Structure 1
Amino acid sequence: DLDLAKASATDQLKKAKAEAQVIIEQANKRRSQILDEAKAEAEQERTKIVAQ
């Protein structure tokens, strides 16, 4: 157990670390989607408003 307390503790920590950051990797991908779309639709609405 005094070996476990490192061998498995560090792995729990590492796995939690990697997942804690790749959650945010996916979330960054999502905000890329959102701030693409924010312009993509706004320009179409511009081209409607000034055709009106």
Structure 2
Amino acid sequence: DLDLAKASATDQLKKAKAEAQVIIEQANKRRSQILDEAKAEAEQERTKIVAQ
């Protein structure tokens, strides 16, 4: 019971690490998309104003 309790705690920490990394990477995924939206909006706006 002492050994399996620490086994449960270590698999919980492994899950917690997994959770930690994924959350960071969805944030990282989000970061890339937003900056691409900003770059796309700026280039469209800029190109039509210079034509104007």
Shorter-chain TM band: 0.7 to 0.9
- CA RMSD, Structure 1 to Structure 2 (Å): 1.1
Aligned residue pair count: 52
Structure 2 gap segments, 5+ residues each: none
Percent identical residues: 100
C-alpha displacement of 1:27: 1.0
Q: Which has the higher helix share?
A: 2
TM-score (norm 2): 0.86
TM-score (norm 1): 0.86
Runs of 4+ in 1 over 2 A off after TM superposition: none
Structure 1 gap segments, 5+ residues each: none
| Alpha-carbon distance in structure 2 between the residues aligned to 1:48 and 1:31 | 26
